[PDB]
Amino acid sequence: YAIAGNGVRVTYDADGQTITLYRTEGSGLIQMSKPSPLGGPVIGGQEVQDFSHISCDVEQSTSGVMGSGQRMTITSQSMSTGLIRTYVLETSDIEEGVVYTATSYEAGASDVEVSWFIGSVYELYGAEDRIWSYNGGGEGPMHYYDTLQKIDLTDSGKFSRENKQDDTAASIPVSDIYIADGGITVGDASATRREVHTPVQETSDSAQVSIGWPGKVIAAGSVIEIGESFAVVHPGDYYNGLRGYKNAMDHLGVIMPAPGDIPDSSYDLRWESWGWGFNWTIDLIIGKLDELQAAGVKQITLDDGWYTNAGDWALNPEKFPNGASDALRLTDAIHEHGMTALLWWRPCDGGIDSILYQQHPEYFVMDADGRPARLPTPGGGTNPSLGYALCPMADGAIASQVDFVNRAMNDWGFDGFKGDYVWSMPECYNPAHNHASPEESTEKQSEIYRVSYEAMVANDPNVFNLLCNCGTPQDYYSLPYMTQIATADPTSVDQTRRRVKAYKALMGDYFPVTADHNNIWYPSAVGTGSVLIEKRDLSGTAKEEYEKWLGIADTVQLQKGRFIGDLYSYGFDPYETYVVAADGVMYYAFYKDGSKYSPTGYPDIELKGLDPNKMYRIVDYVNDRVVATNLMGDNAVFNTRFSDYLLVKAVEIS
Ligand SMILES: N[C@H]1[C@@H](Oc2ccc([N+](=O)[O-])cc2)O[C@H](CO)[C@H](O)[C@@H]1O
Ligand SMILES: [Cl-]
Ligand SMILES: [Co+2]
Ligand SMILES: [Mn+2]
Ligand SMILES: [Zn+2]
Numbered sequence: 001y002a003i004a005g006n007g008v009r010v011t012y013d014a015d016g017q018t019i020t021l022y023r024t025e026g027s028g029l030i031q032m033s034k035p036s037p038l039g040g041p042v043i044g045g046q047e048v049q050d051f052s053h054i055s056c057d058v059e060q061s062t063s064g065v066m067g068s069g070q071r072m073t074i075t076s077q078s079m080s081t082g083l084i085r086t087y088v089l090e091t092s093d094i095e096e097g098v099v100y101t102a103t104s105y106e107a108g109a110s111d112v113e114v115s116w117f118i119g120s121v122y123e124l125y126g127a128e129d130r131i132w133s134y135n136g137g138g139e140g141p142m143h144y145y146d147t148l149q150k151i152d153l154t155d156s157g158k159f160s161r162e163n164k165q166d167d168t169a170a171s172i173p174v175s176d177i178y179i180a181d182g183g184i185t186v187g188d189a190s191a192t193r194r195e196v197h198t199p200v201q202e203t204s205d206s207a208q209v210s211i212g213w214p215g216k217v218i219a220a221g222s223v224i225e226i227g228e229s230f231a232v233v234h235p236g237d238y239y240n241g242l243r244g245y246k247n248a249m250d251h252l253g254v255i256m257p258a259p260g261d262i263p264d265s266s267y268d269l270r271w272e273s274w275g276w277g278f279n280w281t282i283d284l285i286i287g288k289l290d291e292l293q294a295a296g297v298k299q300i301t302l303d304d305g306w307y308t309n310a311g312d313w314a315l316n317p318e319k320f321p322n323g324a325s326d327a328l329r330l331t332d333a334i335h336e337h338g339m340t341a342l343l344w345w346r347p348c349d350g351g352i353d354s355i356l357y358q359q360h361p362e363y364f365v366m367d368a369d370g371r372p373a374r375l376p377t378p379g380g381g382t383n384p385s386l387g388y389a390l391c392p393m394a395d396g397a398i399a400s401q402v403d404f405v406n407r408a409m410n411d412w413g414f415d416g417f418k419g420d421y422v423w424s425m426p427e428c429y430n431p432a433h434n435h436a437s438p439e440e441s442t443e444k445q446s447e448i449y450r451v452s453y454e455a456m457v458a459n460d461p462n463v464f465n466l467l468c469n470c471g472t473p474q475d476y477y478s479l480p481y482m483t484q485i486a487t488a489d490p491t492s493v494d495q496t497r498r499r500v501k502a503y504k505a506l507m508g509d510y511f512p513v514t515a516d517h518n519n520i521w522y523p524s525a526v527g528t529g530s531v532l533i534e535k536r537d538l539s540g541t542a543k544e545e546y547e548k549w550l551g552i553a554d555t556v557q558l559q560k561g562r563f564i565g566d567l568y569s570y571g572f573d574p575y576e577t578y579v580v581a582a583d584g585v586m587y588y589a590f591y592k593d594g595s596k597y598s599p600t601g602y603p604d605i606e607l608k609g610l611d612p613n614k615m616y617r618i619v620d621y622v623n624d625r626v627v628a629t630n631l632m633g634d635n636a637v638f639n640t641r642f643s644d645y646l647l648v649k650a651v652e653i654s
Contacts, residue, residue: 001014001056001072002058002072003058003071003072003089003091004070004091005092005093005095005097005098006091006092006093006094006097007097007233008021008022008023008024008091008096008097008098008099009022009023009024009029010022010072010089012072013035014056017038017051017053017076018035018036018037018038019033019036019037019089020033020035021036021099021122021184021231021233022233023182023233023235025235030181030182031126032122032124032182032183032233033122033123033125033184034123034125034206036121037049037121038051038074038087039087039118039119039121039210040085041105041112041117041118042114042115042116042117043112043113043114043115044115045115047118048078048080048081048083050078050080050081051076051077051083051085052078052079053074053076054075054076055074055075056072056075057072058070058071058072059071059072059073062090064090064092064100065090065189065251065252066092066095066098066100066251067092067093067094067251068093068094069090069091069092069094070090071088071090071091072088072090073086073087073088074086074087074088074089075087082107082108082110083106083107083108083112083218084105084108085103085104085105086103086104086106087101087103088103089101095244095251096244096247097232097233097234097240097241098230098231098232098244098247099231099232099233100189100228100230100248101119101120101228101229101230101231102189102225102228103117103119103226103227103228104223104225105218105223105226106221106222107219107220107221108221111218111219111220112218113215113217113218114215114217114218115215116212116213116214117213117214117215117226117227118211118212119210119211119213119226119228119229120186120210120229120231121208121210122184122186122208122209122210122231123203123207123208124178124179124183124184124208125206126179126181127153127205127206128153128179129153129154130151130152130154130179130571131153131178131179131202131206131207132148132150132151132177132178132179132238132571132572133148133149133151133159133175133176133177133178133200133207133209134148134174134175134185134241134242134502135147135148135161135175136171136173136174136175136187136473136476137161137162137164137165137169137171137175137197137198138164138165138166138169138170138171138423138424138469138472138473138475139162139163139164139168139169139378139379140169140377140378140379140471140472141378141379141471142378142472143470143489144471146492146495146498147498147499147502148238148494148502148570149161150596151177151200151202151207153205153206157202158202159200159201159202159207160199160200160202161199161200161201162199163197163198163200165188165193165195165196165197166424166442167195167376167424167425167426167427167439167442168376168377168378168379168380168423168424169378169379169423169424170193170423170424170425170469170472170475171474171475171476172473172474172476172506173190173196173198173476174187174188174198174242174245175199175200176232176238176241176242177200177207177208178234178236178238178241178569179572180569181235182233182235182236182240183233183234183236183238183240183241184209184232184233184234185230185231185238185241185242185245186198186209186210186231186232187229187231187232187245187249188227188229189228189230189248189249190228190252191252191253192443192446192477193442193444193445193446193476193477194213195213195214195439195442196211196212196227197212197213198210199212211229212227213226213227230244230245230248230249232244232245232248236566236568237501237565237569237570237571237572238501238502238505238570239501239502239504240505240565240566241505242502242505243505243506243565246505246506246507246508254477254480255480256506256508257480257483257507257508257511259508259511262510262511262512263461263462263483265340265416265462265464266483266484266512267512267531267557267559267560268298268299268531269296269298269531269532269533269550269553270297270298270299270301270514270531270533270534271288271292271297271299271300271301271533271535272301272303272418272517272533273285273300273302273303273535274301274517274535275535275536275537276537278305280303280305280319282320282326282329285300285302285330286330289334289339290337292337292339293337293338293339295546295547295550295551296550296551296553296554297339297550298338298339299339299340299341299342299464300334300339300340300341300342301341301342301343302342302344302414303344303535304344304420304421305319306319306320306343306344309352309354309355309387310345310350310351310354310387311350311351311355311356311387311390312351312354312355312356313404313407315327324411324412327411328412328413331412331413331414331415332413335413340415340464341413341414341416342414342417342418343408343412343414343416343417343418344417344420345404345417345418345419345420346386346419346420346421346422347401347448347449347452347467348375348390348425348445349375349386349387349389349390349422350364350387350388350389350390351387351388352387352388354387357372357388360396362394362396362430363391363394363396363397364389364391364394364397365388365389365426365427365428365430365441366391366428366429366430367426367427367429368427368429368438370429372388373388373426373428374386374388374389374426375387375388375389375422375423375425375426376423376424376425376426377423378424378472386422389426389441390448391430391433391441392444392445392447392448393428393433393440394433398448401448401451401452401455402452402455405417405452405456405459406459409456409459409460409463410459415462415463416463416465416466416483417452417456417463417465417466418468419449419465419466419468420467420468421468422467422469423472424442424445425445426442427439427441427442428440446475446477446478449475449478449481450480450481452481453465453482463483464483464484465481465483466482466483466484466486468488468489469488470488470489471488471489472488473488473499473502474488474503476506482507483512484513484514484531485507485511485513485514486513486514486516487499487500487503487513487514487515487516487530490515490519491518491519492595492596493521493591493593493594494595494596494597496516496524496528496530497515497578497591497594498570498576500513500528500529500563501528501563501565501570501578504529504563504565505565509562509565510560510562510563512531512559513529513530513531514531514532514533515528515530515531515532516533517533517534517535520536520542520545522546522549522552522553523549523589523622523644523645524591524645525549526549526552526556526558526589526647527558527578527587527589527591527645528589529559529561529578529580530558530559531559532549532550532553532559534546552621552622555621556587556621558580558582561581561587562580562581563578563579563580564579564580564581564609565579567579567608567609568608570597571597574599574603574604574605574606575590575591575603575605576590576591576592576597577590579608585650585651586610586649586650587621587647587648587649587650588607588647588648588649588650589645589646589647589648590642590645590646591644592642592643592644592645593643593645604637604638604639605637605638605639605646606636606637607631607636607637607650608636610631610633610636610650611633612632613633613634614632614633614652615630615631615632615633616630616632616633616636616650616651616652616653617629617631617651618631618648618649618651619649619651620646620647620648621648622647627640627648628640630653631650636650
């Protein structure tokens with residue numbers, strides 16, 4: 001029993017009750033997965049494994065979620081529970097590497113109580129000493145837990161992570177595991193946010209990636225659908241898997257912005273006031289504008305500390321003693337230096353001591369005990385700066401967000417927004433909201449982001465919009481409404497660079513990403529094809545260093561180039577490597593300063609993706625020196641010494 005799709009083969013063994021995944025390479029298949037068991041319900045703390053094969057049906061010419069392709073339908077039965085399971089797999093003639101899966105269960109004579117449903121599990125075939133993993137969960141830890149994680153098979157430890165999306169976790173419902181020969185991505189196939197896990201677990205000699213959803217009581221003689229997923233077999237690293245997921249999710253209407261519609265100002269070099277913390281003033285910001293303009297900056301953020309309270313989002317009298325005319329004086333001055341102006345806010349937060357909470361508590365989320373619910377930190381808990389959550393289904397809550405947008409753009413003259421410092425959305429029990437279930441608030445969080453953005457666009461189609469779920473992967477269902485992504489308070493060069501690759505995969509190769517400004521890492525920002533940003537008030541040699549790198553970034557402009565993620569594999573090619581094509585020229589960046597993956601010794605550098613018949617001169621564009629005078633495209637290999645980074649371009653020579 002087998003079905004085929006572009007780039008993928010799926011086989012079922014009825015004796016085994018197992019599934020094996022294959023990927024096409026050249027003229028032959030490569031086996032991506034070990035034979036893997038079908039996902040089952042969990043009852044009384046145990047997954048049910050009494051299921052027996054009933055039938056397998058294969059259709060060769062059919063049309064499914066992804067359009068025309070193939071389908072395999074497997075029916076199984078459990079005598080102890082009375083459950084009949086229907087497991088459907090679909091492939092696509094067009095979409096590369098992708099398998100769609102859906103599961104339903106039918107109960108017999110008695111009700112079945114299920115705590116959790118496991119959808120699909122794939123254990124990787126052919127692993128040796130290490131497996132690399134992409135982990136999209138929103139449960140934290142914040143900031144200091146890497147999104148990309150090495151699973152070492154030679155050590156004492158056993159890697160295990162749930163990768164949650166729930167009332168305390170709002171990130172990306174995807175996980176990937178990969179080796180030199182490639183990997184398997186699993187992601188939630190839903191147009192809207194729902195509770196799901198994508199666990200990654202080390203096994204005895206490998207690792208497995210899976211997906212699962214919350215249980216329910218299944219009534220006697222009833223049929224219910226429990227969950228649907230996308231799997232992607234791929235060569236290379238997590239970029240290829242995540243790109244597959246992006247392509248799949250288009251079919252469900254989750255479509256990221258096309259290059260032609262992204263505004264010019266969302267590719268601009270930016271300086272933010274956060275360097276001064278809460279002690280910025282209008283005149284301090286204005287005083288920097290001449291030097292910022294001359295050095296090449298084209299965008300300014302007014303960061304945190306401008307407002308009275310969240311929800312109200314009114315001007316703080318100490319910062320704006322003359323009211324709205326002071327805000328206009330700031331944005332006018334920014335505009336006079338040829339720049340756009342952005343404003344910091346925290347969407348979903350209606351404050352605690354706000355006028356909004358005092359006058360309209362009915363707009364807010366209510367907990368099970370009848371108290372106002374605080375916005376959660378990742379994994380649960382709260383933060384003193386986080387206020388009460390606005391309910392996304394209360395019309396007045398949404399209106400408060402829209403009114404803020406209209407005031408900031410039309411009364412104060414701002415050109416865009418930096419959303420920040422917010423994560424998931426608590427469950428709502430307010431009976432006056434008439435919720436279908438308490439999770440409905442969590443599910444509909446992204447409506448705040450959508451309605452806000454639509455209001456922004458109506459004022460100015462070139463408006464800038466960003467959201468930072470700081471220290472975690474960004475809320476996936478916010479992404480359609482963005483013009484730029486930040487790597488989100490990265491705590492290392494490893495974090496910022498690898499996340500650039502992940503976001504490019506999910507959003508498109510021309511989608512704007514910034515490496516952020518938590519630490520000074522100008523070479524990381526340029527070489528990844530990211531937008532270089534800064535927040536500090538600099539002097540002396542550090543000022544010279546910022547000017548230098550503004551000049552380089554403004555010369556090569558790799559933030560506007562086509563990111564290329566399919567040539568090198570993070571953790572398997574000799575160096576951590578990034579590639580961008582700009583104005584018909586290939587730019588490469590090699591790094592050694594990331595402690596998570598860095599070679600012993602001094603391996604040769606290989607330039608991939610050049611024309612085999614052409615000859616190239618290799619130039620270090622930072623230092624303006626030739627590192628290799630003439631390389632053929634089919635054998636572009638050289639050795640050069642560098643301590644942290646090497647940024648080069650391949651110049652065609654006649
Ligand atoms: N990433 C944001 C963000 O950074 C933080 C700071 C603290 C916390 N926190 O205490 O969870 C989270 C994100 O807010 C800061 C302002 O308060 C700045 O605007 C940064 O650029
Ligand atoms: Cl990371
Ligand atoms: Co942030
Ligand atoms: Mn281990
Ligand atoms: Zn509500």
